[PDB]
Design a protein around this nucleic acid. Structure first.
Ligand SMILES: [Mg+2]
Ligand SMILES: [Mg+2]
Ligand SMILES: [Mg+2]
Ligand SMILES: [Mg+2]
Ligand SMILES: [Mg+2]
Ligand SMILES: [Mg+2]
Ligand SMILES: [Mg+2]
Ligand SMILES: [Mg+2]
Ligand SMILES: [Mg+2]
Ligand SMILES: [Mg+2]
Ligand SMILES: [Mg+2]
Ligand SMILES: [Mg+2]
Ligand SMILES: [Mg+2]
Ligand SMILES: [Mg+2]
Ligand SMILES: [Mg+2]
Ligand SMILES: [Mg+2]
Length: 48
RNA sequence: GGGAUGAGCUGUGGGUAGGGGUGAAAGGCCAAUCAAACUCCGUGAUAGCUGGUUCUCCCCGAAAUGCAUUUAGGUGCAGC
């Protein structure tokens, strides 16, 4: 019989979350921003 | 070293409060703080600025140019 320990999601459905800013083997110190300007600490509006 | 019977010094009690007081006037002083005191709240103010951002390996891999800009250490779009 199928039990609660025989259930598993479809392959490709659940993928892993990207945890940013956790060392140099992943997205490192600046977490993908890189800059020193506006884009390093804030959002730029779309209308601007 | 100056004044040391005077526009003197001092004690006790009181009054004036923050764009307000008080000033023989230095922006002085208002509790070791003053070109607008302190405390709590709005509040986790905002900062094109400086700093910080934490385990791993595999594959690829730039740019520092153009144009516009209250723009020139910022950003949009193109290029990569
Ligand atoms: Mg979630
Ligand atoms: Mg580091
Ligand atoms: Mg940095
Ligand atoms: Mg940038
Ligand atoms: Mg003498
Ligand atoms: Mg004497
Ligand atoms: Mg004398
Ligand atoms: Mg005043
Ligand atoms: Mg003066
Ligand atoms: Mg004082
Ligand atoms: Mg003011
Ligand atoms: Mg508010
Ligand atoms: Mg801030
Ligand atoms: Mg290579
Ligand atoms: Mg520039
Ligand atoms: Mg761009």
């Amino acid at each position: 019989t199928l039990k609660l320990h025989d259930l598993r999601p479809a392959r490709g459905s659940k993928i892993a979350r990207t945890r940013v800013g956790r060392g140099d083997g992943s997205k490192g110190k600046t977490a993908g921003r890189g800059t020193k300007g506006t884009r390093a600490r804030k959002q730029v509006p779309v209308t601007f």
